């Protein structure tokens, strides 16, 4: 029973630690998008100034 | 009373003990759960020799399992009767020696053996009356050949009055599984000759030959080899844990078998071993079984016993018998092959009888023979050792872990000497 309890607690912790990785799969995609947005802003600045 | 405690180390020793205690458990009728379920009253009256008692009527092995790697013990614990062993006696390392005698005897083993020595001394002090110690090991593995003889030494200075027997598996040149076998066999024999009260040589190639030809079975296995070894081991002490016409302990055997203290390397044989097809053929009788015992082909070794003269012989007959034609057949055998018997020792055969036969068999013989044919394994091992050492092949581990070539030279000289005087008495005449 003790082994079962420890294994179950560990396994639930695992399903909880499937999680501050997927979050910045999303967030790192967002950061790459924001860097590309900064590049687009630079392009717009150059075009308008020219 | 007069009990003995088991110590096994290395993969080979562990797997030998695994079948040995399965055999002894079936012999005593003990279930794998440690609960007695025998039918004869005698099955319990001396069950204390190999078992300690725990509360609840349960019986626990008095065996200590030790190794520098935990894989073999973790595997055997899942096998049949593996739950019997006390987890406290299990001691294992985390690195391994890699079949290297230097690593197994100097660096890791010296530090590790403290806990197993603690458990050994505790178990020995717990025993009512200590009779002796028994070790099972293989000389072809460096780590085992190291710590086994190391523990032999440090049990020896502590208990100099007790008896000790080792079952040594030496690497034969026919079936070779490791190339550094000559080195570790050399280093193991050099220390074993100094402290071994008794040593019993076992050869896997001879096991292969006997399982091929005697049983005539198609696919031999390490399980069959272990069964044969276990039956032979149990026959050594059969009359010790069950009654016989002649009570003859291990120390009886020591008194009657070793003429001089350094000649304590013996050869074992068991009978009967019959094929399944010929099992219903054989006419189980004392004369046929004892002649089957003295054939050179029944041995579990490579040394042809007809190439030399037996210094002495010992037969442990097992079953309900009388002694008369037993004795007369002993006399006939000693008269008929008198050329193969060294002359300055008249009546050089001991006979002992145990009243209960082996489980599954009405009549059996266990033979131990001290002969002048054993020089051959030592000679071939020394030849291989010197051929591989003359060019300093693979000596770099042994040099890099604190040991030097002077110890190798001393060991080689020591066993060369040993062969010299062990052959010397073969040519001796009165």
């Amino acid at each position: 029973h003790k082994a079962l309890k420890k294994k179950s607690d560990q396994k639930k912790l695992l399903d909880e630690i499937f999680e501050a990785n997927q979050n910045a799969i999303l967030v790192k995609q967002k950061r790459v998008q924001e860097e590309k947005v900064e590049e687009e802003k630079i392009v717009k600045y150059n075009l308008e100034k020219a | 009373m007069r009990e003995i405690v088991h110590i096994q180390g290395g993969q080979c020793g562990n797997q030998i003990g695994a079948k040995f205690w399965e055999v002894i458990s079936d012999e005593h009728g003990i279930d794998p759960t440690g609960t007695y379920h025998g039918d004869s009253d005698l099955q319990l009256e001396r069950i204390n020799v190999y078992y300690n008692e725990a509360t609840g009527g349960r019986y626990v092995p008095r065996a200590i399992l030790m190794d520098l790697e935990p894989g073999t013990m973790d595997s055997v614990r899942a096998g049949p009767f593996g739950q019997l062993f006390r987890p406290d006696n299990f001691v294992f390392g985390q690195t391994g020696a890699g079949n290297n005698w230097a690593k197994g005897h100097y660096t890791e083993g010296a530090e590790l053996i403290d806990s197993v020595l603690d458990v050994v001394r505790k178990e020995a002090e717990g025993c009512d009356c200590l009779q002796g110690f028994q070790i099972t090991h293989s000389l072809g593995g460096g780590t085992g050949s190291g710590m086994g003889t190391l523990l032999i030494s440090k049990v020896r200075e502590e208990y100099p009055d007790r008896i000790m027997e080792t079952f040594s598996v030496v690497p034969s040149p026919k079936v070779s599984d490791t190339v550094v076998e000559p080195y570790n066999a050399t280093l193991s024999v050099h220390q074993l000759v100094e402290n071994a009260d008794e040593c019993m040589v076992i050869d896997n190639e001879a096991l292969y030959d006997i399982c091929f030809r005697t049983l005539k079975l198609t696919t031999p296995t390490y399980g069959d080899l272990n069964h044969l070894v276990s039956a032979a081991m149990s026959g050594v002490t059969c009359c010790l844990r069950f009654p016989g016409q002649l009570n003859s302990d291990l120390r009886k055997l020591a008194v009657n078998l070793i003429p001089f203290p350094r000649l304590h390397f013996f050869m074992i044989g068991f009978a009967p071993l019959t094929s399944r097809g010929s099992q219903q053929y054989r006419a189980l009788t004392v004369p046929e079984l004892t002649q089957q015992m003295f054939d050179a082909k029944n041995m579990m070794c490579a040394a042809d016993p007809r190439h030399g003269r037996y210094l002495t012989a010992s037969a442990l007959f097992r079953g309900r018998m009388s002694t008369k034609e037993v004795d007369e057949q002993m006399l006939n055998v000693q008269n008929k092959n008198s050329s193969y018997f060294v002359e300055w020792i008249p009546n050089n055969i001991k006979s002992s009888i145990c009243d209960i036969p082996p489980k599954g068999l009405k009549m059996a013989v266990t033979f131990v023979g001290n002969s002048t044919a054993i020089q051959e394994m030592f000679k071939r091992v020394a030849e291989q050792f010197t051929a591989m050492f003359r060019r300093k092949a693979f000596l770099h581990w042994y040099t890099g872990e604190g040991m030097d070539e002077m110890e190798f030279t001393e060991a080689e000289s020591n066993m060369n000497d040993l062969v010299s005087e062990y052959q010397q008495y073969q040519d001796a005449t009165a």
Binding site: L13, F18, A20, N21, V27, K28 | -
Partner: protein
């Protein structure tokens, strides 16, 4: 029955107080309107009798833009209408303007609000203050508030979360003067002072969070997370609780040395924390890593005096002790000779909360460390050098002389800085 009062002065102070107040409201479950969607809130909030909760915070500024933005934002119904003190004229980065000219007419109303708020509390733990040091109005108002409070209340504890300028990155050109003046003012009047420079947090966001074009909101959210980790012990049950008064029992050997620097872990993007176990050993190694320090200083350049560190989550004391043993065994970190043990540990059960739309994710284990070490002399030395470079030619001195400040005020601050550096040097040597 325990309370703490929070002070936010200056543009940066208000912007970080707002950030900490979204996080506190989310953690306590309080809606933006202040109502209950459906009693540990008593540390930060007060019950009006029926319904909404009034935060125990005060906002001060002489520039009304941020105050108007707060009063027109979604949190207009939360704060009390008459606790957001707003002036008319900004000090324009002048410390003398905010300390002698226009802050005096506002500090009276501020003390009125402070005493009105303190009369409600019965188990007041102390005061926290937030202010940007690189701003004249913030520095002057904070210094004046510390001066008045130290005589109004006396032994009550005050903790200042000062945001010192970066070693080379600067927004203004006259900030060293008011930074040194405010440091001189607060040296003898602040019990605890935490360094919160921006360049280190920029580097942290760039490396761990992988944030390449950051803004002030992320910095304020990280500061809010640090504050929540520090203050969670007072409002959440834990196996080993630590109070505010239990800080300079362990972190401040001598009254003069009360400046310390913080770090948090795991400060990492939410990309590689599910794919690792977040073991206590590796999180406390990341916290102790010099590159993960939240203040731009090198701990390898000086000895360690004390470290008070708090875990929140399902951490184990045995694992914490095992990690501390490894840290002590490590050779790259050395403590001072007269301190055999310098680690104070706290344990809390509540995991950190996550804000929607933020950068940090939800984790079951976190640690916040507050370290006082002898390596912080470098920032004081570089600030002194920068101040001296401009004070050699008496540059920009007229802008402070014309606001009522005497000429000799800078000399005493310089002497105090030199004495403080000498004190650090004397403490840092072994016996």
């Amino acid at each position: 029955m325990r309370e703490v009062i929070s002070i936010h002065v200056g543009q940066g102070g208000i912007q970080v107080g707002n950030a900490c107040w979204e996080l506190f409201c989310l953690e306590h479950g309080i809606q933006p309107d202040g109502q209950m969607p459906s009693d540990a809130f008593n540390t930060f909030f007060s019950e009006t009798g029926a319904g909404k909760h009034v935060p125990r915070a005060v906002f001060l500024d002489l520039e009304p833009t941020v105050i108007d933005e707060v009063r027109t934002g979604t949190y207009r119904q939360l704060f009390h209408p008459e606790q957001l003190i707003s002036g008319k004229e900004d000090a324009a980065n002048n410390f003398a303007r905010g300390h002698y000219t226009i802050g005096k007419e506002i500090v009276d109303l501020c003390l009125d609000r402070i005493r009105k708020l303190a009369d409600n509390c019965t188990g007041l733990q102390g005061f926290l203050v937030f202010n940007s040091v690189g701003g004249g109005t913030g520095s002057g108002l904070g210094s004046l508030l510390l001066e008045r409070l130290s005589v109004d209340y006396g032994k009550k504890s005050k903790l200042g979360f000062t945001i010192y300028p970066s070693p080379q990155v600067s927004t203004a050109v006259v900030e060293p003067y008011n930074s040194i003046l405010s440091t001189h003012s607060l040296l003898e009047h602040t019990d605890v002072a935490v360094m919160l420079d921006n360049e280190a947090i920029y580097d942290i966001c760039r490396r761990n969070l992988d944030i390449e074009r950051p803004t002030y909101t992320n910095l304020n959210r990280l500061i809010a997370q640090v504050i929540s980790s520090l203050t969670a012990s007072l409002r959440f049950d834990g196996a080993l609780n630590v109070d505010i008064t239990e800080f300079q029992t362990n972190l401040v050997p001598y009254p003069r040395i009360h400046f310390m620097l913080s770090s948090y872990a795991p400060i990492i993007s939410a990309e590689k924390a599910y794919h690792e176990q977040l073991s206590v050993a590796e999180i406390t190694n990341s916290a102790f890593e010099p590159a993960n320090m939240m203040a731009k200083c090198d701990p390898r350049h000086g000895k360690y005096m004390a470290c008070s560190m708090m875990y929140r989550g399902d951490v184990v004391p045995k694992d914490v002790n095992a990690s501390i043993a490894t840290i002590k065994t490590k050779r790259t970190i050395q403590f001072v000779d007269w301190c055999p043990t310098g680690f104070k540990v706290g344990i809390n059960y509540q995991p950190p909360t996550v804000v929607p739309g933020g950068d940090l994710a939800k984790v079951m284990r976190a640690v916040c460390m507050i370290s006082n070490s002898t390596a912080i002399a470098e920032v004081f030395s570089r600030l002194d050098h920068k101040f001296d470079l401009m004070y050699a030619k008496r540059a920009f001195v007229h802008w402070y002389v014309g606001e009522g400040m005497e000429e000799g005020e800078f000399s005493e601050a310089r002497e105090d800085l030199a004495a403080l550096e000498k004190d650090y040097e004397e403490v840092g040597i072994e016996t």
